[PDB]
Amino acid sequence: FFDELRIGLATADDIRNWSYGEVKKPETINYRTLKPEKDGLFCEKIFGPTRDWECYCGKYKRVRFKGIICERCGVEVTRAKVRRERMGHIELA
Amino acid sequence: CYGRSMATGKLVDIGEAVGIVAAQSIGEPGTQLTMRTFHQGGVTGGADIVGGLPRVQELFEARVPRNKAPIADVAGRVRLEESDKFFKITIVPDDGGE
Amino acid sequence: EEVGKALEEFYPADNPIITIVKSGATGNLTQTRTLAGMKGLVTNPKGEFIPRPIKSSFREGLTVLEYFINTHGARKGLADTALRTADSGYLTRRLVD
Amino acid sequence: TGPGNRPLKSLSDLLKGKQGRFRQNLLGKRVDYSGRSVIVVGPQLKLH
Amino acid sequence: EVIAEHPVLLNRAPTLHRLGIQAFEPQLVEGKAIQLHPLVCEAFNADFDGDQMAVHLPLSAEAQAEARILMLSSNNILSPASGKPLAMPRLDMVTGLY
Amino acid sequence: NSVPGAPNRVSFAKLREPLEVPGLLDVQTDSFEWLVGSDRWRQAAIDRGEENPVGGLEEVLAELSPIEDFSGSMSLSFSDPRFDEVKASVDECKDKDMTYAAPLFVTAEFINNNTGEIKSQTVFMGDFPMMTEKGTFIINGTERVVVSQLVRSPGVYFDETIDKSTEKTLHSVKVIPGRGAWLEFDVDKRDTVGVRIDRKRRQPVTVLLKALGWTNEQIVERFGFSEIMMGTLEKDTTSGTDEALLDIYRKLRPGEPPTKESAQTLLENLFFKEKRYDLARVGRYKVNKKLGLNAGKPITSSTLTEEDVVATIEYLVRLHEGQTSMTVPGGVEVPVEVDDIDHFGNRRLRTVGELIQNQIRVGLSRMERVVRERMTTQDVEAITPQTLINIRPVVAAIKEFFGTSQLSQFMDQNNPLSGLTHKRRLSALGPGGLSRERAGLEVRDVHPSHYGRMCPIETPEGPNIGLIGSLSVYARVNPFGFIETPYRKVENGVVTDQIDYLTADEEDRHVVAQANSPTDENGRFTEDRVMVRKKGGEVEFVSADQVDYMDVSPRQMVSVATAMIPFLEHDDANRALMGANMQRQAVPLVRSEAPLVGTGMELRAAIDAGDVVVADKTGVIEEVSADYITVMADDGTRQSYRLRKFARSNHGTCANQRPIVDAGQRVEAGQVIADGPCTQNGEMALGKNLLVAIMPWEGHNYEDAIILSNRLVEEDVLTSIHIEEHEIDARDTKLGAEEITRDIPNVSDEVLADLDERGIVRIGAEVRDGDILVGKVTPKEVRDTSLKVPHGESGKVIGIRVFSREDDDELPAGVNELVRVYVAQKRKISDGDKLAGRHGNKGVIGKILPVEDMPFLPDGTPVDIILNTHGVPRRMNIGQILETHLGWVAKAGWNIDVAAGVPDWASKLPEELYSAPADSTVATPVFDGAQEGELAGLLGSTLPNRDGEVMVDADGKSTLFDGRSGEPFPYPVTVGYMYILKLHHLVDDKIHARSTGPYSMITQQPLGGKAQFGGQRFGEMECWAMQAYGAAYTLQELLTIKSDDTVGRVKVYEAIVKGENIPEPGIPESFKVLLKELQSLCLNVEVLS
Amino acid sequence: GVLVVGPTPAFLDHIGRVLPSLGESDAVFMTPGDFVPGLHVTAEDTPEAAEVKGSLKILDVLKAAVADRQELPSEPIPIDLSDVTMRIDAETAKWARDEARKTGLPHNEARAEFVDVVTYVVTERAVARIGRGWLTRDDKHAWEKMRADVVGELEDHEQFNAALDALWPILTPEDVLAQLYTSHERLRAAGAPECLWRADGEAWTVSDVPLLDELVDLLGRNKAADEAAERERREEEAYAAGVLDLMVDREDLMDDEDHLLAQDLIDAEELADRFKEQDNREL
Ligand SMILES: [Mg+2]
Ligand SMILES: [Zn+2]
């Protein structure tokens, strides 16, 4: 367990550490095909799958094997709603 | 400093929440006490004395009583004068002055 | 008051209605007076006193007017018993805070 | 001012209101492993 | 074989103090009403004119022990407000012993 | 008696009833008659009423017609409503879920002023629901009650009050119509009179006066006795009539382009035009008698005026100034005073007919707007009413009053009396009265205007105390909706036999006496200082010459469920309330038994309710079976009464009728031919007489708990039948058809054995939680969503009610079939079930004892119910002791030994009460009944037992034996017979438990409730109590592993089923989302350790 | 209530010896010089200037005395901002003073109308930069900078608001007289004679007390002061709402029969209105 709780200001270093990618593109989703966008809002290429176990590409959609970084999308197939426990970031000019 | 526990009868333990017990013990019998009349509207019944839950909320908030009375600022003796409807009181200190 | 006095006197000690009281099991002598003596004065819905008292007990049986004017304060006690809980809760939440 | 006449939402507006982990429920939790019934007396019983 | 030595908490609302929740050892009875010792009925403020009661069950050893030790009715004989006993002879018992 | 087959029930009554109990649902049938303008009401009114009796439909139409257009060219008018016979009957409407309605037709005439042509037609207005002779409506099968409404009558009401801040006594005035806008006036905390036209900004008062065409000379001649009103004048920057109308049209229509003619047409077409503002005849009459106007005149003109808007101000101003007397310039003198708001001369009753009138009015207004929309868009002289008229709106209003309202309620039938008190009910809630803003504490109280009009006792126990009540038994309703009660006219001190139905306003003007007041020679009083009421309920003793009226009977101010409580003057008021409201919720028993000791108001309460069957015509009985009864009258016409057998009430109870007649029986008219669920020989029998001993036992009757014999379980004494209804629909899904079949998906064929060909369950079979009832397959190919027995339910399948579309009878949008399955359960009294008497004595059943260990009498008779001593005196309900005594005196007869004269305790007894056999029945009316002299010596008589031994002495006590030990209890115990009631509060309906199940997926806790199969609320106070013990792990457990933590409850279920240590959250879990979103805000957070 | 006027309260010594219920609860003694709640300037008599300031021909002065404070700039007080140009002139100030006089409302009441008119004036330079706007928004939304400069200038205001306070100052009625007696052109500017002149204004006499009173009817009030009292009232009512949320719900009851609760007889507002200090004093 724990005993104490401390806060403080966050530099760019700790954030660059927390996030595993970069956000660059302005859009949420695509209506047509209802498939998420890329490199922007609703990261489907950094955090992991759309819902779970998949990648943006569907190249990998099975449970037997996990962690194989999609050689197309560079994606780690896993579950448990990671994209809710995942923070991106940007390096604004 | 707290003392013993009234439930166990033995000296109180370490970690025992003794503020919640106090709140409960004081609040539970709050229905056995007088209160402010429950009527929609009327005259302020505080003209007469009302000294139940009102007095208790008063004290626990430490607001200024209604039927306030002054207290001795310095020991000594008293000199009492009465005009029409006004009381004057002068305390003269036994050792000091002013 | 005189009736309650004369009534706790007149009654023996082997009586059950007095025994259950003086034993601390239940009850009061106010109820025993209301039952075998007189109900006495009753309240308006304002909360004031009706100066015409109920000289009848729940043994003699109450007249129609007496019963009607007792109902006044008999309904005014079902809400009080609820608002008092909200007041108590206010103060208790303060103290627990 | 978002579409129409509204104040557009914001990160640090989540917590000024009822929503957020910081606001206290003042309610219950409708707990599992629980029940309700009517009580009768048993005088053949021990306190425990 | 499983209802044994496993306590259960009995609660009755409104709960204005801690004796309104007490731990008890279950005795399995035929029927659909809960049998309640007549001495825990002044804390609970319970009677048998229809009143209901809620039952909660602990699962973790820690909570089982907290019930067996802190909550058990054979330990909360007294009020944590004046030291007075609560689980003491009421009306029938009183008139019998008197 | 006065009823043909009246089983004799001797009475201790010492007073005579100069007025019989009027009808007890004549407040729900007179109003519907009025509405539909039946001929009965027509005659009744022509007797005492105008010579042009208009109904409620007639009036609505007359106010609607004639529908002229802006061009005053073409006009439409309605008249002559007319009802044709009902399509179905009550029983058919229920069997088929139809509605009890009659077609309504109306003559529509269409005039054209251009050409003087007429196009009359008898147009159809839709089916109109009808009020059944039992005072009910039938809607889609269900019996429903339209409960009356208590509302503030239209008129002017002046209310003094106190300013929250200045604590200054001020005044006010409010004018409220039946339809239109309000008009208020005030005298402010600064002595400036002002007005609040249509509850808008408070502008001054002289503004209005000018807007009506008044010159300061007039304002100063009418007024001028005052100096706050002149001072208000002086500070009217808006001097000038038209400037004032501009001010008003501005405050009302602010900014938008004004106009003078628009101004006058607004100030006129808001108060003075009788289409946007109406004071119904009652408001007009109130205003007139209040202000001193239009004395003895033809009230025909029912709208506001300009003289009253001035006399109102004048009244107000002489009020603020303490003047008690007023006189309008030309009116009559008047008292100046404030007007109470709970008083019933100001409160009035909207009966069912008025409610339906109003909703029809709404529908007709909409149909009128449509008529106009459709009248100036279609070639003239070619448009006919049938083209101008679309009835579809009206029906909706009707179909929206019953189907979904608050005053149209599912019928409250746990028993005949439950439904008969649901009809004489007076509700202060619903659209038109106080809804939520005034549920306070001064409207929920009793008012001396309730005497004879509203019961001071019968009011439910829940949240609607003081809001809902029940009408008295001798009370009726004026045509203006004010409630009336009768009194007897005293002339010189001698009670006349003449009746007068007064209302509160009239009553407050005289001295109303009491029924028990003595009389010696054709009326004159015996005493000199007789007791009476007065204006403000001020009971007083006064000389018998000051008296002007008198109450016909005691029990005037009580209701049905409260005139059926013997020895009520011996029971306090809260426990009498309990007794009534528990006598409502009493479940019918298999075989019913009527009280030995009762009241005279148990025969009528069953006749005047409708669950009994009575003869429509004198005659003999031609055939008697369990279901049908067939009578041959004297006229030769043959009647046939069909009886309800094991039908389900709206509350699960049974509704079985049974005949009480033999073939060849010369019945009279009004004679009971069948008994209902809770009647015996035609009188309410809601419970049973039981042998009771008032004594404590070995702890098993502690704190209002009580004990029983196993006899009441062997002989099926307190047994009751309960029926349940389960329905399933085969509705469309767009993937195929929801089919009802027996080829269920793969399941045990053993479940498919009690199912008939069509996959529905077979009558006579017995069921149990989970057992299939009807196999319904919704397409996928096929799934299994069948109707299975719920949790904690079982019984025999009585019968079935199927509704198909292959008949096209009727089914809602998208349905193809409905199946209703009924299941019955015989429920015996059991440990936990609630039990009660008519006196508020209630309790649960702690112990059921074998008769061999029950306190028995020297004759071997074991008592049947043991009740404790400790609850009687602190609860103040000794009426049950008196009931016990008299029950003994009646089950064992009596013979007063008159050989040596009549004892002095019997000098007031009615002869024919000097003797009676065993199992006799008596009556003790609530306030004129058995006394204590008439009951003390009447306990000695007590005819001996079969062996000559008297088992109860003159004090009410016997000598019992411990059925366990064998020795006699060393003191005599009080024994007798008590009437005991079984209640709907049963334990098979309350026992609820849960370990796992479905959650709410919104708050993500378990659901709340018993049908939802939910959990129990662990609240805040409980958390406090759980902290004061110092218990942290139980609290963690309760707040995480049970309600919210959705990844922990699974781990817990698995742990337990596997038998491993129940885990612990290594680090709290509600924290992570907040951790993320505070980190996302660039605030470093570090869970330390 | 009751009011008694005169030098000696010995007249109020009768109301107290025959009607004590008032002589110590209701009656109020005042002297010509105590009419105002907060000062008892009685000994400060004055020569025949009284006649002037004790007769309704002074009302005119009062009105004009405010007119001598509905002032206009001597020269355009420049708009001290970078990307705009001063439009403040006797032109705009004149337009707006006339507009404010034209609603017939006291000074502090029409402050708001004055300020709104001046904001819609400066809207000119907000959108009339040269021809109109000149930004890529002015083809569909001609008012992006209109209501981003004018709805931001109530925030970039200190200069604007303070240099407005010269032409429509929030007068506390004590100052309008202090700096009406010291000056020498105010007396004539507002219509007053010159006897009224005096150096120290705060040296108040008996004949300036009713004037001080009338000033409060001539000026108005802030109308926006009680803004935190609303916060505290709302939070007290919320605490009471929570008190009621704690209590047992009719559907979670463990009693035998339903009964009255407090949630169906009282609300947060009234439950909170009775735990307030609700101080009370005599009339
Ligand atoms: Mg109870
Ligand atoms: Zn991929």
Swiss-Prot record, chain A:
Q: Where does Zn(2+) 1 bind?
A: C55, C57, C70, C73
- Known partners and oligomeric status: The RNAP catalytic core consists of 2 alpha, 1 beta, 1 beta' and 1 omega subunit. When a sigma factor is associated with the core the holoenzyme is formed, which can initiate transcription.
Under which name does UniProt file this protein? Answer: DNA-directed RNA polymerase subunit beta'
Query: Which start and end residues of the full protein are shown?
Result: 6 to 98 of 1317
Described function: DNA-dependent RNA polymerase catalyzes the transcription of DNA into RNA using the four ribonucleoside triphosphates as substrates.
Tell me which species this is from.
Answer: Mycolicibacterium smegmatis (strain ATCC 700084 / mc(2)155) (Mycobacterium smegmatis)
* Family per similarity comment: Belongs to the RNA polymerase beta' chain family.
* Disulfide cysteine pairs (residue numbers): none
- Write the lineage as a comma-separated list: Bacteria, Bacillati, Actinomycetota, Actinomycetes, Mycobacteriales
From Swiss-Prot, chain E:
Where Mg(2+) binds, per the record, is at D47, D49, D51
Q: Which family does it belong to?
A: Belongs to the RNA polymerase beta' chain family.
Its quaternary organisation is: The RNAP catalytic core consists of 2 alpha, 1 beta, 1 beta' and 1 omega subunit. When a sigma factor is associated with the core the holoenzyme is formed, which can initiate transcription.
Instruction: Give a short account of what the protein does.
Output: DNA-dependent RNA polymerase catalyzes the transcription of DNA into RNA using the four ribonucleoside triphosphates as substrates.
The protein's name in its UniProt record = DNA-directed RNA polymerase subunit beta'
This protein's species is Mycolicibacterium smegmatis (strain ATCC 700084 / mc(2)155) (Mycobacterium smegmatis)
Its lineage reads: Bacteria, Bacillati, Actinomycetota, Actinomycetes, Mycobacteriales
Query: Gene encoding this polypeptide?
Result: rpoC
- Fragment boundaries within the full protein? 489 to 586 of 1317
Swiss-Prot record, chain F:
Report the outcome of R425 to L/P. Rifampicin (Rif) resistant
**Keywords annotated in UniProt:** Antibiotic resistance, DNA-directed RNA polymerase, Nucleotidyltransferase, Transcription, Transferase
Kindly give the InterPro entries that the UniProt entry links to this protein.
Answer: DNA-dir_RNA_pol_bsu_ext_1_sf, DNA-dir_RNA_pol_bsu_external_1, DNA-dir_RNA_pol_su2, DNA-dir_RNAP_su2_dom, DNA-dir_RNAP_su2_hyb_sf, RNA_pol_bsu_bac, RNA_pol_bsu_CS, RNA_pol_bsu_protrusion
Query: What Pfam families would the database entry show?
Result: RNA_pol_Rpb2_1, RNA_pol_Rpb2_2, RNA_pol_Rpb2_3, RNA_pol_Rpb2_45, RNA_pol_Rpb2_6, RNA_pol_Rpb2_7
What is one GO biological process annotated to this record? DNA-templated transcription
* GO MF term list: DNA binding; DNA-directed RNA polymerase activity; ribonucleoside binding
Which reactions appear under catalytic activity for this entry?
RNA(n) + a ribonucleoside 5'-triphosphate = RNA(n+1) + diphosphate
The record describes its quaternary structure and partners as:
The RNAP catalytic core consists of 2 alpha, 1 beta, 1 beta' and 1 omega subunit. When a sigma factor is associated with the core the holoenzyme is formed, which can initiate transcription. Interacts with RbpA, which partially restores Rif-inhibited transcription.
- Function noted in UniProt: DNA-dependent RNA polymerase catalyzes the transcription of DNA into RNA using the four ribonucleoside triphosphates as substrates. This subunit often mutates to generate rifampicin (Rif) resistance. Interaction with RbpA partially restores Rif-inhibited transcription; once the subunit is Rif-resistant however RbpA no longer stimulates transcription.
Q: Which PANTHER family would you find in this protein's record? A: DNA-DIRECTED RNA POLYMERASE I SUBUNIT 2 (PTHR20856)
Q: What is this protein called?
A: DNA-directed RNA polymerase subunit beta
Query: Gene that codes for this?
Result: rpoB
